[PDB]
Design an enzyme around this catalytic site. Structure first.
Site, PDB file in Angstrom:
ATOM      1  N   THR B  44       2.112   3.211   3.197  1.00  0.00           N
ATOM      2  CA  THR B  44       2.166   2.753   1.839  1.00  0.00           C
ATOM      3  C   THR B  44       2.531   1.292   1.760  1.00  0.00           C
ATOM      4  OG1 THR B  44       2.732   4.966   1.111  1.00  0.00           O
ATOM      5  CG2 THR B  44       3.254   3.161  -0.376  1.00  0.00           C
ATOM      6  N   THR B  45       3.589   0.918   2.461  1.00  0.00           N
ATOM      7  CA  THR B  45       4.057  -0.460   2.506  1.00  0.00           C
ATOM      8  C   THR B  45       3.023  -1.375   3.150  1.00  0.00           C
ATOM      9  OG1 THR B  45       6.301   0.363   2.700  1.00  0.00           O
ATOM     10  CG2 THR B  45       6.037  -1.987   3.200  1.00  0.00           C
ATOM     11  N   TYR B 107      -3.123  13.021  -6.417  1.00  0.00           N
ATOM     12  CA  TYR B 107      -4.114  13.050  -7.489  1.00  0.00           C
ATOM     13  C   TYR B 107      -4.618  14.475  -7.781  1.00  0.00           C
ATOM     14  CZ  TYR B 107      -7.440  11.882 -10.989  1.00  0.00           C
ATOM     15  OH  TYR B 107      -8.060  11.791 -12.210  1.00  0.00           O
ATOM     16  N   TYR B 133       3.956  13.625   5.156  1.00  0.00           N
ATOM     17  CA  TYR B 133       4.594  12.678   4.320  1.00  0.00           C
ATOM     18  C   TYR B 133       4.607  13.174   2.909  1.00  0.00           C
ATOM     19  CZ  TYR B 133       4.824   7.893   2.163  1.00  0.00           C
ATOM     20  OH  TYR B 133       4.948   6.756   1.431  1.00  0.00           O
ATOM     21  N   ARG B 138       4.341   9.245  -6.029  1.00  0.00           N
ATOM     22  CA  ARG B 138       3.029   8.575  -5.886  1.00  0.00           C
ATOM     23  C   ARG B 138       1.796   9.502  -5.924  1.00  0.00           C
ATOM     24  NH1 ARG B 138       3.412   3.198  -4.230  1.00  0.00           N
ATOM     25  NH2 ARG B 138       5.507   2.585  -3.499  1.00  0.00           N
ATOM     26  N   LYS B 161       8.285  12.831   6.986  1.00  0.00           N
ATOM     27  CA  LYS B 161       8.844  11.753   6.200  1.00  0.00           C
ATOM     28  C   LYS B 161       9.049  12.230   4.797  1.00  0.00           C
ATOM     29  CE  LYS B 161       7.665   7.032   4.573  1.00  0.00           C
ATOM     30  NZ  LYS B 161       6.640   6.011   4.487  1.00  0.00           N
ATOM     31  N   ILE B 203      11.878   5.976   8.081  1.00  0.00           N
ATOM     32  CA  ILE B 203      10.708   5.201   8.088  1.00  0.00           C
ATOM     33  C   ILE B 203      10.952   4.291   6.902  1.00  0.00           C
ATOM     34  CG2 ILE B 203       8.217   5.071   7.773  1.00  0.00           C
ATOM     35  CD1 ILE B 203       8.065   7.767   9.272  1.00  0.00           C
TER      36      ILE B 203
END
Ligand SMILES: [K+]
Ligand SMILES: [K+]
Ligand SMILES: [K+]
Ligand SMILES: [K+]
Lengths: 292, 292, 292, 292
Positions: B44-45, B107, B133, B138, B161, B203
């Site tokens: 993501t980052t 989504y 994850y 999100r 994560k 993480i």
């Protein structure tokens, strides 16, 4: 055009997960016959998320071909990268769709300023009308009224699908936009309420299986006959809720198959086949709407 | 290596939005020198959201090339279609990555059973270790402990994560999985707490600019020296919160630019440049950490 | 009666925290002159929570005395012990109030079945009409439509103050009750929306300081003139929000003092005096409503 | 004593809703015999909500009389008017209680500054140790760590019962207060986690029927033997959740009746008798714990 009962049509599939052309034709004719005002092709209910970009485009082109000018077609066109959104939208220029339904970037949770730039950029690279689609429960991201106000000043941004189910939004947005910006509900269960507050129609999941009732409900609403409209609404209300007893479009695809509108209820992973208990629930809702 | 301070590394870009190899090499040398356990490439980052598959594979291969065996690399590989996740994953088999970090379908909001079949299938078609994850803010979907328990029985699903910031999950998960399943925080502000409850590492976004401190904090937590680890965590705590004052990785890329670790703080739309106010807040957080 | 603009009147106090009779008379005359339809005495805005039961009764008796038949008076009567609720209600039998506003037990979070028994018991021990008051943000407890439906079958339970701000409730409740059960908004900011959906009026905080506008807005609504009504609404909207910039009734008491309607803005602990920044905010909202 | 397993004791009642002295004595002897550190008399679980002040004082004095010096007693004393809290507290000075458990003002939703002046004033007018109680799900207000930090500087505010279930609060609070400030869980399902993060004990509902196990779990947690404490917690975990399958103290009073610790499971309205389904669920939880 962009008023009344708009269907977020399912993408019917064969047992292998590919688009079923005969089933699609049957749904498109059912809409033309039912009074549905337009078709949103490859929206959320159409499994936009599990189709690749070429498959998506094939389904849109096929849908337009089969509609044969009898009923306008809006394509789902969201991307959460602004560059990808522009490209994907460019594909549909000069294709014959009347507009795009473009979803808020999902996942990366932009600021309101980023949302404004994303959509402004999309709009500047096409002449197609754009309907903004706000659906925070899927995207993690909420397009606020103030930002919708700013975006409505862009020439070809012309309305919004408001799927929060938060009815205070209708007038917060109306007071910030011109009289011809369109406001459409994306939440079947609150859509009549939404129109009674001043909304102009609904992009509906329920209209997949009750197209005539939904189209009659929205004519009545638009004419001010809310109490006649509510009678249809109460007939449909178990459907409006139970079409989400399992994740959309799992229930509505099963219902389409049970009513004989599509050949199979197949979906793509991570959507799973409907559970036994979900089948009975959706069956009961259909019986209540007087469709079995 | 799947314990300790693992950085979710920024993908540094030039003024045109293209990956800057020179800035990336500096980051990688910095993490090798500072004792970081591993690098998550294109999480993501790392702007997973806005890179296409070509660029995503390039960034990962370039990171592996620059790391040159000196530090393990894990790729971000999630997708919301199971077919596409399987396919993106195949592209990295025999690449040299030690593992994949695979996000829950975002989504489309699948059921727990859907999530189970999703990750099980991804895992079935690779030898690579997979790290699930979970980041409901999100994706709009929350992988529950019971489902995590079922997935841990799959041979190469080796850890999670957990980015909800909900610390109850640590021991709910841990009691359902074997002792070698890795639990990793994905929420920097709660990561020391997560480790004190039995988590194995983090993480981290903060690790991008405070590598050494993060690695020492995680080593102290691993040995049980929580009071000592918390001294470090209290000096990082403003960064842990303010690196999200605007959407991640806006603040952290700015911070990396201000420290000289990357040549520019350019991101891809819909991420926008940091505001003047964000700059002041992040700069005060860096000074609190002792980095400026 | 129970329609139009009903004020949840402040309990004005001297510097010592006791009811200020001159100030109360001035507010009551201002309402009679302004077209306000009724007064709720010692509701939430009237500091029901910090008055003891005798002080509460004194304020109600005083309010009725000063109203002198010119304007009907509803008393706040909630308790979260059903026995205490019955006793407190019995005090007001034969007192002259036209009804009671009875709050859901706050704190002990009863089941819906317990809520039904609590209110049914209250109603059976009085001949006074009862308006249910649902305000989950204060009570931790949500009275659902299905339960309101059951309660509306009790002779003297005659309406509800719906303070959730959740507008889907209006029709969910209407479809379950007879045509003369009254539905009143308890949320100023959404109250015009609430009436446009079929609600019959509002128990308002804003009407403390804009009684005439509020009464004109609700006549217009009740006549179907929503667009005229909205113009008043937009004038008042900053007030509808900023009267809660600090906890109610801290702002509305300051506003009453600034407009000269009450002698002091004193409140009882744990309510605190208005902050400087809150004063400026409320001042601006008053200027906008054209009251300074 | 303000560490270890502290029970929030039920207030046992006869069929008429009056305190049953014989059942209370049995509970108290049971807690003395089972190593419970202290008794919270007339907390939430003790039906604080539905006892008047006369009965509240009686229950506390009867508990002190029966305990006979063998176990410390703490009274529930919160009120949402500061004047009334001060006044209820004075009534217990020199009673023999070791402390008060004082809840944040419920219903009126004061600001943090209000909360600060509230508890500071209560504390100023007694010599008794005060334990703040934060339970946002019941009060609608959340005492934040910064405010707790300010209040801990007051000499006789000695600890907090933190009932949010939000485990981040433990080290946010602990870093702002001195080492002798007591942190106590008020959420049984997360209490072992709370202690592992640095909490000192638990004010427990589960302790009503599993005293010994709770006391041993808390002693093991205090010495750092978390893996051992967690074996016990996993057998209690169904009780920790199912004692809230219906509103507390409905399930726990039923459980106490089924174990023979109290003669009846009568509560005061608006609490209602346990449903048949609740009975089955709670009974299976008791069997999982090894108590039946
Ligand atoms: K426009
Ligand atoms: K495994
Ligand atoms: K009635
Ligand atoms: K202290």
């Amino acid at each position: 055009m962009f008023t009344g009962s708009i269907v977020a049509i399912v993408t019917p599939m064969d047992e292998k997960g590919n688009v079923c052309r005969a089933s699609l034709k049957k749904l498109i004719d059912y809409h033309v016959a039912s009074g549905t005002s337009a078709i949103v092709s490859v929206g959320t209910t159409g499994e936009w998320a599990t189709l690749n970009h070429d498959e998506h485009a094939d389904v849109v082109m096929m849908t337009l071909d089969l509609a044969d000018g009898r009923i306008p077609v809006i394509a789902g066109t969201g991307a959460n990268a602004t560059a990808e959104a522009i490209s994907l939208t460019q594909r549909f220029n000069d294709s014959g769709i009347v507009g795009c339904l473009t979803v808020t970037p999902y996942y990366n949770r932009p600021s309101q300023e980023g949302l404004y730039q994303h959509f402004k950029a999309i709009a500047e690279h096409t002449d197609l009308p754009q309907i903004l689609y706000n659906v925070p429960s899927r995207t993690g991201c909420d397009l606020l009224p103030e930002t919708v106000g700013r975006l409505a000043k862009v020439k070809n941004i012309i309305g919004i699908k408001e799927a929060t189910g938060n009815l205070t939004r209708v007038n917060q947005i109306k007071e910030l936009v011109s009289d011809d910006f369109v406001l459409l509900s994306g939440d079947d269960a609150s859509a009549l309420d939404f129109m009674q507050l001043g909304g102009h129609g609904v992009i509906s999941v329920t209209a997949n299986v009750a197209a005539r009732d939904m189209a009659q409900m929205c004519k009545l609403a638009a004419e001010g006959h809310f109490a006649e409209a509510r009678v249809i609404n109460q007939r449909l209300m178990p459907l409006h809720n139970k079409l989400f007893v399992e994740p959309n479009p799992i229930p509505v695809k099963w219902a389409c198959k049970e009513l004989g509108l599509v050949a199979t209820d197949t979906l793509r992973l991570p959507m799973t086949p409907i559970t036994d208990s979900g089948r009975e629930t959706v069956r009961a809702a259909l019986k209540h709407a007087g469709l079995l």
